[PDB]
RNA sequence: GUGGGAGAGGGUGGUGGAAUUCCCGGAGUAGCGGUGAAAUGCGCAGAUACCGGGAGGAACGCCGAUGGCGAAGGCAGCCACCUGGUCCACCCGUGACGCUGAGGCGCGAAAGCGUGGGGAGCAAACCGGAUUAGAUACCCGGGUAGUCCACGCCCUAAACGAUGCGCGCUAGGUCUCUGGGUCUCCUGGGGGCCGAAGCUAACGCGUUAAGCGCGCCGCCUGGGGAGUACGGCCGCAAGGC
């Protein structure tokens, strides 16, 4: 009910999960998916196969919205952070460009004990 | 690979306003290039870093950028 | 095989067909070292399988063994705690061995009274695409495509 | 003295972007988070993810080094101001004015104390979830003091180069920071690495001495008892000498 025909795709990948949000050219989201949206529940959500399935499910929902041309934004690191982009390439969506926009601070905040 | 100073003129390392030549010393991202790729001496690099930061605060050089093709 | 490649034994050809897979299957039928009785089993089964269906037992044997050969399987790999079932492909030699073993084990798990009858009907069913050996093969393949989520643990 | 130089040396005020958190709004469904697995937890009062706006605190990515500065503790965005130390060249001035230094005095990471502010993130104590034979721990989710600032205390440390300060003498080679020079190089002054002689119980040190000497200060005399007791002094206390 939107007929967007083009937009962005953000891939947020961590070591616990990978989620994909397909949005429109001025930033508002259209659809999304993740390792928990699909069947997987626990650490299974962080596997590259779950990332592939999440990307494919989000891409098919975007097809339902009528998406053809997609620009890719990537933030984070984890298993399947690349597999998401591979499935997104071979999903039937013409990939416009891939961009890694992983937010990194200029050393402002103190991390948790795990990250030091 | 070519180092920045190798392909460049007799330019001012203290001019924070010349974006044309200061852009050469930034990476694909907004990061300042190491001495391995700038071919500068320690003193030259130390001056270039401060001039780059000055240009950044004047909105002439990017504080950070986005990586492509990743 | 810590040092060497463990060169494969080259079986003798067969006296009836001249084919090596027949000798391999006859060895897989043999027990307690009776290759004579096993050969008689296989060849009476050959007569029965050539008569009950008017086809050459050669190509039916070949097509059955080809139908039973699987293309993927699972092996256990120890990673981060308890091991996981990781799928992977199969060697051609191992495909041959597994196919013949499943053939014999599904033939002797059959109801038929005589051994040769079991062998013949098992080969028939396997050549048609059904039977117990092909069921075990397709269960092996069903292990794949199922735990495929571990496709990054190939090793 | 003159003339040049490098620097996260210190103090004060300003100021920039990234990120976290929170709030407002838009769009958008069903989970997010987390782990070896999990669960507590958060989510239909609309989360997570995405976009725009706002608020606030703390710390300064790339440059960055095996680098620099400082007496030590220690000191990293940028700008301005106030200010310390130091190096080199000129061979100009004074004319032994030097070295060390018991006591004294000042400085002194972090944590801790007092009064008043501040509070994002982190986080002793604490509250829960797991794990385990038990879990008072490691792992996960929260969370106060604190961490931050002003002022006044506290005087400890693996406060380490486990190497007191100063001066002279004793092969070189290699990398480096910073000056000067007639600039394959030389000559100072710092930071490393090999290694002459020599030293050392050995490891190792070796013009940055743990070598050869001189001056002065501090300290040592088997281990446990014990940095305890008593006494004194200091401290609001903790406690310190
Ligand atoms: Mg997870
Ligand atoms: Mg400074
Ligand atoms: Mg300062
Ligand atoms: Mg909202
Ligand atoms: Mg709820
Ligand atoms: Mg609930
Ligand atoms: Mg607030
Ligand atoms: Mg660094
Ligand atoms: Mg020094
Ligand atoms: Mg000065
Ligand atoms: Mg004179
Ligand atoms: Mg005179
Ligand atoms: Mg003195
Ligand atoms: Mg004294
Ligand atoms: Mg102190
Ligand atoms: Mg403190
Ligand atoms: Mg306080
Ligand atoms: Mg926390
Ligand atoms: Mg905690
Ligand atoms: Mg318990
Ligand atoms: Mg001495
Ligand atoms: Mg020079
Ligand atoms: Mg030197
Ligand atoms: Mg040297
Ligand atoms: Mg010697
Ligand atoms: Mg040495
Ligand atoms: Mg000496
Ligand atoms: Mg000695
Ligand atoms: Mg003593
Ligand atoms: Mg004693
Ligand atoms: Mg004590
Ligand atoms: Mg006494
Ligand atoms: Mg006392
Ligand atoms: Mg008292
Ligand atoms: Mg004590």
Curated annotation (Swiss-Prot), chain A:
SS bond partners: none
Database matches in HAMAP family: Ribosomal_uS11 (MF_01310)
InterPro entries the record matches: Ribosomal_uS11 (IPR001971), Ribosomal_uS11_bac-type (IPR019981), Ribosomal_uS11_CS (IPR018102), Ribosomal_uS11_sf (IPR036967)
Quaternary structure, from the entry: Part of the 30S ribosomal subunit. Interacts with proteins S7 and S18. Binds to the C-terminus of IF-3; however exactly how IF-3 interacts with the 30S subunit is unclear. May contact the C-terminus of Era.
Region (Disordered): 99-116
PANTHER family, alphabetized: 40S RIBOSOMAL PROTEIN S14/30S RIBOSOMAL PROTEIN S11 (PTHR11759)
Organism this protein belongs to: Thermus thermophilus (strain ATCC 27634 / DSM 579 / HB8)
Record's protein name: Small ribosomal subunit protein uS11
GO molecular function: rRNA binding; structural constituent of ribosome
One GO-annotated biological process of the protein: translation
From Swiss-Prot, chain B:
Key words of the record: Ribonucleoprotein, Ribosomal protein, RNA-binding, rRNA-binding
Biological process terms in GO annotation: translation
GO annotation, cellular component aspect: ribonucleoprotein complex; ribosome
Domain of life: Bacteria
An annotated Gene Ontology molecular function: structural constituent of ribosome
Protein's job: Located on the back of the platform of the 30S subunit where it stabilizes the close packing of several RNA helices of the 16S rRNA. Forms part of the Shine-Dalgarno cleft in the 70S ribosome, where it probably interacts with the Shine-Dalgarno helix.
Protein family according to the UniProt entry: Belongs to the bacterial ribosomal protein bS18 family.
Description of how the protein assembles with itself and partners: Part of the 30S ribosomal subunit. Forms a tight heterodimer with protein bS6, also interacts with protein uS11. Binds to the C-terminus of IF3 and to the central section of Era.
Record protein name field: Small ribosomal subunit protein bS18
Swiss-Prot record, chain C:
Keywords: Ribonucleoprotein, Ribosomal protein, RNA-binding, rRNA-binding, tRNA-binding
Pfam families: Ribosomal_S7
GO molecular function per UniProt: rRNA binding; structural constituent of ribosome; tRNA binding
GO CC terms: small ribosomal subunit
PROSITE patterns: RIBOSOMAL_S7
CDD domains, alphabetized: uS7_Bacteria
Keyword tRNA-binding: yes
GO biological process, one term: translation
Gene3D superfamilies: Ribosomal protein S7 domain
InterPro entries in the record: Ribosomal_uS7, Ribosomal_uS7_bac/org-type, Ribosomal_uS7_CS, Ribosomal_uS7_dom, Ribosomal_uS7_dom_sf
Summary of the function given for this chain in its UniProt record: One of the primary rRNA binding proteins, it binds directly to 3'-end of the 16S rRNA where it nucleates assembly of the head domain of the 30S subunit. Is located at the subunit interface close to the decoding center. Binds mRNA and the E site tRNA blocking its exit path in the ribosome. This blockage implies that this section of the ribosome must be able to move to release the deacetylated tRNA.
Subunit structure: Part of the 30S ribosomal subunit. Contacts proteins S9 and S11. Binds to the C-terminus of IF3 and to the C-terminus of Era.
Family assignment from sequence similarity: Belongs to the universal ribosomal protein uS7 family.
This protein's name: Small ribosomal subunit protein uS7
The encoding gene: rpsG
């Amino acid at each position: 009910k939107r007929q967007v025909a083009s937009g962005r795709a953000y891939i947020h990948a961590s070591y616990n999960n990978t989620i994909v949000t397909i949005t429109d050219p001025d930033g508002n989201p259209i659809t999304w998916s993740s390792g928990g949206v699909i069947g997987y529940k626990g650490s299974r959500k962080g596997t590259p196969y779950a990332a592939q399935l999440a990307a494919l499910d989000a891409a098919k929902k975007a097809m339902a919205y009528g998406m053809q041309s997609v620009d890719v934004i990537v933030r984070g690191t984890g298993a399947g952070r690349e597999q998401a982009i591979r499935a997104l390439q071979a999903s039937g969506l013409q990939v416009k460009s891939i961009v890694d926009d992983t937010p990194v601070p200029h050393n402002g905040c103190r991390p948790k004990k795990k990250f030091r | 690979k070519a180092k920045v100073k190798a392909t460049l003129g007799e330019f001012d390392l203290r001019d924070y306003r010349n974006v044309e030549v200061l852009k050469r010393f930034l990476s694909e991202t907004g990061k300042i290039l190491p001495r391995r790729r700038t071919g500068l001496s320690a003193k030259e690099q130390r001056i270039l870093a401060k001039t780059i930061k000055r240009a950044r605060i004047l909105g002439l050089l990017p504080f950070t950028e986005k990586l492509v093709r990743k | 095989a810590r040092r060497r490649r463990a060169e494969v034994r080259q079986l003798q050809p067969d006296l009836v067909y001249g084919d090596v897979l027949v000798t391999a299957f006859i060895n897989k039928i043999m027990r307690d070292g009776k290759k004579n009785l096993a050969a008689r089993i296989f060849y009476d089964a050959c007569k029965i399988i050539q008569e009950k269906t008017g086809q050459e037992p050669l190509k039916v044997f070949k097509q059955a063994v080809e139908n039973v050969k699987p293309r993927m399987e699972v092996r256990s790999r120890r990673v981060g705690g308890a091991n996981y079932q990781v799928p992977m492909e199969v060697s051609p030699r191992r495909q041959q061995s597994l196919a013949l073993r499943w053939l014999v084990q599904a033939a002797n798990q059959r109801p038929e009274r005589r051994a040769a009858v079991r062998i013949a009907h098992e080969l028939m069913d396997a050549a048609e695409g059904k039977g117990g050996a092909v069921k075990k093969k397709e269960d092996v393949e069903r292990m794949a495509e199922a735990n495929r989520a571990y496709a990054h643990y190939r090793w």
